[PDB]
Amino acid sequence: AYLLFYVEAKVAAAVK
Amino acid sequence: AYLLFYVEAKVAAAVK
Amino acid sequence: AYLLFYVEAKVAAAVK
Amino acid sequence: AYLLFYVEAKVAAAVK
Amino acid sequence: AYLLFYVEAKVAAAVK
Amino acid sequence: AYLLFYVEAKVAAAVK
Ligand SMILES: [Cl-]
Ligand SMILES: [Cl-]
Ligand SMILES: [Cl-]
Ligand code: NA
Known part of the structure; x- marks a missing residue:
């Protein structure tokens, strides 16, 4: 999945 | 305006 | 030293 | 309503 | 002084 | 155990 702030x-x- | 952390x-x- | 989040x-x- | 922590x-x- | 939340x-x- | 803030x-x- 993608790491985001x-x-x-x-x-x-x-983490979505 | 500018986005900042x-x-x-x-x-x-x-946002300033 | 290094700046980190x-x-x-x-x-x-x-700052480590 | 009620104040809560x-x-x-x-x-x-x-405040609920 | 007084302790507050x-x-x-x-x-x-x-603490004020 | 005890509940504390x-x-x-x-x-x-x-909770200690
Ligand atoms: Cl947490
Ligand atoms: Cl807020
Ligand atoms: Cl602090
Ligand atoms: Na916080």
Whole structure:
């Protein structure tokens, strides 16, 4: 899957 | 405006 | 030293 | 409504 | 001084 | 065990 950072504030990491 | 990440700790997003 | 972001969740900054 | 703190980690506030 | 928690979201501590 | 909040900043929960 893809590694991403996004804004939720804090910058959060996710793997979708 | 410009999209930026900066350190505040957590990494924070801002649009200046 | 090196500037890095890592995942701890939130994205955190460190200088090692 | 009710004022509450809960654990999400960090302690988060909510008003339900 | 006084110890307090407040909402900034996360619950944050301060001493005023 | 005991439920506690402490300051780490954010207020964090722990069970010791
Ligand atoms: Cl927010
Ligand atoms: Cl800090
Ligand atoms: Cl977590
Ligand atoms: Na946080």
